Amino acid sequence: MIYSKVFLKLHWGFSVVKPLAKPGFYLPPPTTLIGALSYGKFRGVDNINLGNVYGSPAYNFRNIMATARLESEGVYTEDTGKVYIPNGRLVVVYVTDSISKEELEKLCWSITRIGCKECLASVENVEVGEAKKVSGRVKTRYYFRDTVKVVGRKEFLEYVTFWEENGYIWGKEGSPVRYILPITTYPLASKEVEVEAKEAYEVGGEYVVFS
C-alpha cells in the first residue's frame, strides 16, 4: 500500500450541487477527488467507450481510496450552494495500491480544479510514502463512512449522503451511501474525533479510517 498527500491552495472555493432548489455540499465527495486525480492523464478527451456506453473518462480509477480535510474556516452560502474559503488550504490524502510511486507523484502535480470550471485550485506541495495498517483506537479528521462506530463525545457528527462509482455513467443514479463528517455547521471548520477503527492506515502522523 502506498499513500500521497497534497496541499491545495484554493482560489475562492469549490462547489458541488446535490442530486435530485440547488443546495450544495460542505466538503467535496470522493468521486470528485478521484476524477480530479484522473484528470492529469486524460487531458483532452471527454468520452471513452466503456464497451456498452460512454459514461466518463474516469471509470478507470474506480478502485482508489481518498479523503480530504480543511485547514481553515469557511462560510457556506446559498445564493447554488457554495463554500467560500478564499486563499484557504485543502489537504487531500490518496491511498492506493495500483500504480507505482512515480505515477501517483506525477499525477498529484496535475490537478487544477475541484468541482466545476470556476473552482480553480493551485497545488503547493506533495508527499509520497508507505502506509501501515492497524485496528486500534485512533484520532482522525478526515471524514469516514457511516458504518464506523464512535467512542468520543457525539458533538460534531454531520450525516450526509454520497454516490458509489456506478454514477460515473449518464442516465443513471448512483446508490446512496451514508457518510459522517466531523465538522462545525457554522462557521465551517475541521475538528478531530476519536474512533475505534477496524482498518486505519497511518500516513505520516495522521490516522485515516476507511472501515
Place this chain on the structure above:
RNA sequence: AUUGAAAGUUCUGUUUCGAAGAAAACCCGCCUCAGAUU
C-alpha cells in the same frame, strides 16, 4: 475532464426651484534723558 458538461439580472432616469448675520460702540485719562568734563 469530476452530478461534471452548456448560460450576463440586461436595457431606460437631474434632488430642481428661492432667501442680505443686519443694526448700535474712542484704547484713553498722567510723565523731560536729566545732570560734570579743553
